[PDB]
DNA sequence: TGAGGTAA
DNA sequence: TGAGGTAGTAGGTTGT
DNA sequence: ATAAAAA
């Protein structure tokens, strides 16, 4: 079907045109600018009973598509500002950022007011047209006139095909067409995971069950929760052994007081230095949220990467159960799952067990067909720390390694890449035909030259043939370069809908966008694009994009829900908590 | 665009043979037909010819001369050797009971003779394999309901729709044993059970319990049925389970006996499973239509007639369904809301309805009465929260209806949990101490902390039914009121919960205004017929609603009825109200339509005719130029029609637009109204209309009923199913 | 802190 | 009980 | 206009 893009054609000059548009848009009375490419209206909504007003506006940019014309890209935006008191300073009619505060997306002040910024395809694509028709007119080409148009770009947008996934005991899942098979794709994915189990059948390490003491928690609620979790995790991964329990005292709760005793008293005496463990956070009674947040941060970051910790909340565990009066026995005082509250508890337990398996490096499934390139590398530079993932063919081999970054950082990163590649290439992917680095953020050539040095060393040792191999670097943008929005024009009563999963748009032969969220999943609003840009190398961009999209279908955290990032960057974000 | 319907065409009627063999009167004829059909094992197609009634029987089966013991006398019944022939192209109305009954019987027999199926009633067949992966103690069974159709194109159709049943996993074996026969007996009598009985599954109604199988004489009988069974019921049956007595759910016969092991128990969709189930049976258009197509292809194939073949086709009917247009609404200070086409204005219809009501207030601007704010005392619920809630509610009401005076507070204590002594203590002591017996008020239910369930609703029910004619109240729950304010002393609404409290208050105030008979809005254009009289009788109580043109005049009237006295009361009420109200609101009425819920026995038409004759005697209304009739509205549709729209989107099926109608006969139609501009999950359900008497036009009545559907007074932001007259009757008339 | 996208 | 619809009938061949 | 109570 035909698709509608968010591109209004203008019928080098890039910076000159941007200057003209910015200068003419800054003169509008009901239009105050906030960034180089962000504007807002000088009025809040009506019927807002809070102490914070919201400000509508639009995001604007220019595009240089391959057709041979310049285009305008427009998308909505929203700001939150308190009314009674960075600041918004005043000088006559000239208002600019530097006596009112500008709020951030965090804290409870804005969290209750967020549905106003989410618009579906029809509402969003009519608001964009209204903004174009109203404000984006009477624009001047300095002395001349600029024809900012309407009736947005209509194109036949192609899409990738959903790859065939590989599960345990074979039992693959493949999509043949736009039939009832694809309609239940996410449900089939989750059901196959639940039935067959995880693909990785390697042995387990030692796990623990460190929970609060008896003075704060009962001795039967924890027993029932542990038994249910053990049953589910044994059904999923049959190699699980046991879930031995550690009890630690509360010792009041004001500010990080329990953290001092947590390591030296109970953890050191029981020799629990090595393991994975599971922690229940004490908030059963009335609690101060700041203490719980600080406790979570200190529990995750106090220990170095040994004993990686996945936590849980005691409130939900207690709410999911009921204190039965053990009718039939004496003194059991056990807790049971409420009969009307079984499905939600099952979903809770499934998600928690999946998370604990992810932190245990047991991947649930993989792709049946090999990707076009053998080696994929994901590098992220966390605060003062860095993380690397190595992704081999199909997805059966994913390796993760953290590192402390102390310049000599390039030397350390190059050494890490060299040793990891020389250790792992002969084991999993002998004679690779291509190495791709996927870097989150911005690239400066350090990773590319490190890969070049490692390739030269490996060719000196004869591991990989230099002539047939290729290497390249691609950059992932979590915030898109330009806010591209597309919709599918249909015959239904609502004439627009979200694009299908896999719709790609290449702006330049080295830059493009992928819409992973789409038809087989359900979302509120319009899908946002994931932006990729290949910087250097001798790769084919189309193959890299197809492999990245196939990596997006590997949703290890929530298989039922959709996934926005490829599994390598998502795994870094999950397993790279500070230190 | 085209719409895919739920009908499958029988493309073999051109070569089907057919044959013949031959209130109190209607009941006697029905009884005669039931008795002959029971003894001949076939369909009865009772025919009227030459002012006489005969029972139709196909010529293959014989019929022996005898007598049937009727109530006045035992009428002799006799075979008539004359046999009549019906061609494929002459199915005139006297023969309409024929063809229909023959096909029905044949299809029911062949469907009940299936392996992986069983029948629940005359027209519902379910699978014997329940839904997999249910963690509760309730099995969900999925099946279909079918019906025959006589669409005016000239062909018979099969209408098939999905259905679900909820049955516990095991009943009468692990629930009651011989040691507690008299303990829980009263918790099972009068219910509906499923009996397997080998490979002949049927539903039953239990008349009580009995002795055990080893003593009641019936062993070696069930062992015969479980021997030739595809299910190993040998382990199920043990000589310890007691013998239960059953009858058929249809009518009364002798009290048969059977064991308690094979009997499972069914649930009507009110006892339990609410909000823990009922979400598995909600299916969208594409999924439901795919399941229907699979059922038709799986079981409605290679069907056999008596000697021929039944060629039921596939690819269900594809037509072009027409629709009515959305009427234009009228609000306070004019402020019309009209829809010009399929544009953005149609998209925000419900939201703009609510916004216009919020901005402009209610349209009815008459005076008010004395109001109360029945609320717990100072020790329970305190006083500062009460004062803040009262201030906010008063501000909202005065913003909505500017004739509001005040909100006089009344305090009551709670004491203990009795639900009957607290009934007298709560509203028969403090309200009787004051002069607060006439008014409207609104009560705040005490549910602050650790309130016990299963009684508060009972209390609430009592609170809705003591002083009904003089103290019509609207309830509210203190748990939700206390969930917004938090102590700081003084009480202030929390900053995070500001929109939620606003929505709660707006809906509560709108419901309280509806109790006060202050209609928020009305239609702009007049209806085709001036007067609409909606009648609805249930639970010994009757309710009438008089709707004048435009709806600016909607008058509700409750009545108590106990059957000739009932008809006299109905006639008196209709005549008195019409004579009182016609000269005021509708001078020289053009027509009178009685929208009746349920089934019409002809009493309404007689009452309307008598009232019209008396009115013409008074000279108020004419006789040559006047129309009057009765239209029956069915809450549960006769044939289960479903409509979906064909679109090129990724989901190829969509719900039809609001107001899409399809008529099957000259006097039978279906309307779909919960469609596009509103948001629902699942498929829209039809509304069924059919005339009974009178000389009205059916198109005008259908369009006016759809126009009345668009008047939503309870929740303006959501969809509506019933027309405003029946919806108002159901909202009021709480006892 | 059960978890995803959309909002930023 | 702030509220809406979607889910949900009637229940004649006979099935000891 | 808002998220549930509802794979
Ligand atoms: Mg987490
Ligand atoms: Mg109510």
UniProtKB/TrEMBL annotation, chain A:
Gene3D superfamilies: Ribonuclease H-like superfamily/Ribonuclease H
InterPro entries linked to this entry: RNaseH-like_sf, RNaseH_sf
GO molecular function, one term: nucleic acid binding
Source organism, top-level taxon: Bacteria
UniProt name for this protein: Piwi domain-containing protein
Source taxonomy: Bacteria, Pseudomonadati, Bacteroidota, Sphingobacteriia, Sphingobacteriales
From TrEMBL, chain B:
Molecular function via GO: nucleic acid binding
InterPro entries attached to this UniProt entry: RNaseH-like_sf, RNaseH_sf
Name used for this protein in its record: Piwi domain-containing protein
């Amino acid at each position: 079907k035909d698709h509608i893009l968010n591109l209004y054609r203008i019928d080098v000059v890039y910076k000159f045109l941007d200057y003209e548009i910015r200068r003419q848009l800054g003169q509008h009375r009901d239009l105050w600018k906030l960034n180089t490419h962000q504007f807002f209206l000088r009025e809040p909504m009506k019927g807002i009973q809070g102490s914070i007003n919201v400000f509508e506006g639009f995001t604007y940019k220019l595009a240089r598509l391959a057709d041979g014309h310049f285009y305008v890209t427009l998308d909505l935006s929203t700001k939150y500002i308190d009314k009674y008191c960075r600041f918004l300073y005043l000088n006559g009619d000239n208002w600019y950022t530097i006596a009112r505060m500008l709020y951030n997306t965090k804290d409870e002040r804005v969290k209750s007011l967020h549905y106003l910024s989410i618009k579906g395809p029809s509402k969003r694509f009519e608001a964009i047209n209204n903004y174009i028709s109203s404000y984006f007119k009477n624009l001047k080409f300095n002395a001349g006139k600029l024809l900012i148009s309407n009736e947005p770009l209509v194109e036949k947008i192609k899409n990738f095909w959903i790859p065939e996934l590989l599960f345990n005991n074979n039992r693959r899942l493949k999509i043949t067409g736009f039939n009832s098979g694809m309609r239940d794709f996410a449900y089939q994915r989750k059901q196959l995971i639940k039935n067959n189990g995880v693909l990785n059948r390697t042995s387990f390490d030692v796990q623990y069950l460190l929970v609060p003491d008896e003075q704060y928690m009962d001795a039967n609620l924890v027993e029932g929760f542990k038994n249910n979790a053990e049953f589910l995790i044994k059904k999923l991964a049959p190699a699980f052994d046991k879930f031995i329990i550690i009890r630690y005292p509360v010792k009041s709760c004001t500010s990080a007081s329990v953290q001092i005793q947590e390591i030296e008293k109970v953890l050191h005496r029981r020799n629990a230095l090595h393991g994975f463990a599971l922690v229940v956070l004490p908030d059963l009674d009335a609690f101060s949220p700041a203490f719980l947040k600080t406790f979570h941060e200190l529990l995750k970051s106090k220990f170095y990467p040994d004993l990686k910790v996945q936590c849980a909340s005691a409130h939900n565990i207690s709410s999911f159960f009921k204190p039965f009066s053990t009718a039939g026995n004496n003194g059991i005082v056990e807790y049971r799952v409420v009969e009307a509250l079984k499905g939600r508890f099952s979903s809770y337990l499934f998600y928690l067990v999946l998370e604990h398996l992810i932190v245990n490096r047991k991947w649930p499934y993989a792709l049946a067909k090999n990707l076009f390139y053998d080696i994929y590398i994901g590098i992220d530079v966390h605060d003062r720390h860095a993380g690397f993932t190595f992704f081999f063919k199909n997805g059966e081999q994913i390796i993760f390694h953290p590192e402390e970054v102390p310049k000599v950082r390039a030397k350390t990163l190059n050494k890490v890449i060299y040793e990891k590649l020389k250790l792992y290439i002969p084991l999993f992917a002998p004679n690779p035909n291509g190495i791709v680095i996927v870097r989150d953020g911005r690239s400066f050539g350090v990773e590319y030259k490190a890969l070049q040095a490692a390739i030269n060393t490996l060719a000196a040792e004869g591991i990989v043939n230099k002539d047939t191999v290729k290497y390249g670097v691609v950059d992932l943008h979590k915030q898109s370069s330009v806010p591209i929005r597309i919709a599918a024009k249909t015959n239904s009563y609502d004439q627009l809908e979200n694009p299908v999963a896999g719709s790609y748009k290449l702006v330049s032969p080295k830059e493009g966008f992928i819409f992973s969220t789409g038809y087989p999943f359900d979302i509120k609003g319009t899908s946002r694009p994931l932006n990729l840009s290949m910087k250097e190398g001798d790769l084919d961009f189309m193959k890299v994009m197809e492999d990245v999209f196939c990596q997006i279908m590997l949703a290890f955290s929530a298989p039922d829900k959709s996934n926005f990032l490829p599994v390598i960057i998502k795994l870094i974000d999950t397993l790279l908590e500070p230190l | 665009k085209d719409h895919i319907l739920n009908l499958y065409r029988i493309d073999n009627l051109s070569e089907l043979d057919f044959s013949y063999k031959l209130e109190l009167l209607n009941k006697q004829l029905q009884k005669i037909a039931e008795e002959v059909s029971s003894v001949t094992k076939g369909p009865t197609a009772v025919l009227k010819r030459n002012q006489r009634f005969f029972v139709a029987v196909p010529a293959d089966k014989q019929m022996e001369d005898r007598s049937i013991d009727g109530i006045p006398f035992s009428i002799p019944i006799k075979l008539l050797p004359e046999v009549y022939r019906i061609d494929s192209k002459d199915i005139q109305g006297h023969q309409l009971d024929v063809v229909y009954k023959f096909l029905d019987y044949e299809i029911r027999r062949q469907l009940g003779q299936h392996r992986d199926l069983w029948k629940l009633n005359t027209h519902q067949f379910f699978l014997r394999e329940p839904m997999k992966g249910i963690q509760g103690s309730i099995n969900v069974f999925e099946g279909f309901t079918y019906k025959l159709a006589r669409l005016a194109d000239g062909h018979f159709y099969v209408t098939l729709d999905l259905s679900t049943k909820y049955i516990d996993k095991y009943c009468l074996s692990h629930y009651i044993n011989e040691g507690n026969v008299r303990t829980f007996e009263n918790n099972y009598k009068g219910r509906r059970f499923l009996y397997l009985n080998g490979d002949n599954w049927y539903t039953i109604e239990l008349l009580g319990f009995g002795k055990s199988v080893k003593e009641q004489d019936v062993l070696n009988y069930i062992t015969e049925k479980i021997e030739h069974s595809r299910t190993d019921l040998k382990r199920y049956v043990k000589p310890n389970d007691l013998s239960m007595s059953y009858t058929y759910p249809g009518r009364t016969m002798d009290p048969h006996s059977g064991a308690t092991s094979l009997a499972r128990m069914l649930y009507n969709t009110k006892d339990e499973r609410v909000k823990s189930l009922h979400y598995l049976s909600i299916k969208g258009p594409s999924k439901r239509f795919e399941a229907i197509n699979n059922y038709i292809s799986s079981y409605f194939k290679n069907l056999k007639f008596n000697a021929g073949k039944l060629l039921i086709s596939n690819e269900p009917l594809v037509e072009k369904i027409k629709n009515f247009w959305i009427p234009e609404l009228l609000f306070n200070n004019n402020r019309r809301l009209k829809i010009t086409g399929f544009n953005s204005g149609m998209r925000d219809f419900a939201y703009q309805r609510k916004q216009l009501i919020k901005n402009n207030g209610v349209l009815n601007r008459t005076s008010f009465d004395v109001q109360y704010l029945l609320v717990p005392d100072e020790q329970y619920m305190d006083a500062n929260l009460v004062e803040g809630f009262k201030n906010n509610a008063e501000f909202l009401i005065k913003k909505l209806a500017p004739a509001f005076d005040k909100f006089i507070i009344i305090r009551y204590p709670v004491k203990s949990c009795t639900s009957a002594s607290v009934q007298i203590q709560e509203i028969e002591k403090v309200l009787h101490r004051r002069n607060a017996l006439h008014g409207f008020a609104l009560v705040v239910l005490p549910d602050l902390d650790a309130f016990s369930p299963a009684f508060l609703k009972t209390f609430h029910e009592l609170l809705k039914s003591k002083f009904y004619p003089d103290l019509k109240v609207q309830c509210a729950s203190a748990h939700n009121i206390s969930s917004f304010f938090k102590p700081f002393v003084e009480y202030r609404v929390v900053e995070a919960l500001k929109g939620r409290f606003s929505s709660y208050l707006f809906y509560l105030v709108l419901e309280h205004l509806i109790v006060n008979r202050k209609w928020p809005y009305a239609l702009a254009k007049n209806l085709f017929y001036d007067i609409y009289i909606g009648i609805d009788v249930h639970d010994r109580h009757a309710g009438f609603t008089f709707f004048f043109k435009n709806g600016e005049q909607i008058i509700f009237h409750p009545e108590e009825v106990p059957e000739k006295v009932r008809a006299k009361t109905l006639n008196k009420v209709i005549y008195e109200k019409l004579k009182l109200y016609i000269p005021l609101f509708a001078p020289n009425p053009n027509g009178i339509v009685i929208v009746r819920d349920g089934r019409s026995f002809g009493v309404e038409y007689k009452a309307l005719q008598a009232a019209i004759n008396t009115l013409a005697a008074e000279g108020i209304v004419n006789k040559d130029t006047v129309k009057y009739g009765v239209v029956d509205l069915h809450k549960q549709s006769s044939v289960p029609i479903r409509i979906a729209a064909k679109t090129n989107s990724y989901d190829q099926l969509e719900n039809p637009v609001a107001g899409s109608y399809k008529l099957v006969s000259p006097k039978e139609g279906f309307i779909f109204s919960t469609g596009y501009p509103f948001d629902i999950k699942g498929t829209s359900r039809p509304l069924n209309l059919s005339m009974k008497e009178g000389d009205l036009d059916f198109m005008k009545v259908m369009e006016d009923v759809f126009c009345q559907i668009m008047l939503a007074f309870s929740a303006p932001d959501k969809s509506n199913f019933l027309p405003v007259i029946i919806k108002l009757i159901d909202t009021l008339l709480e006892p």
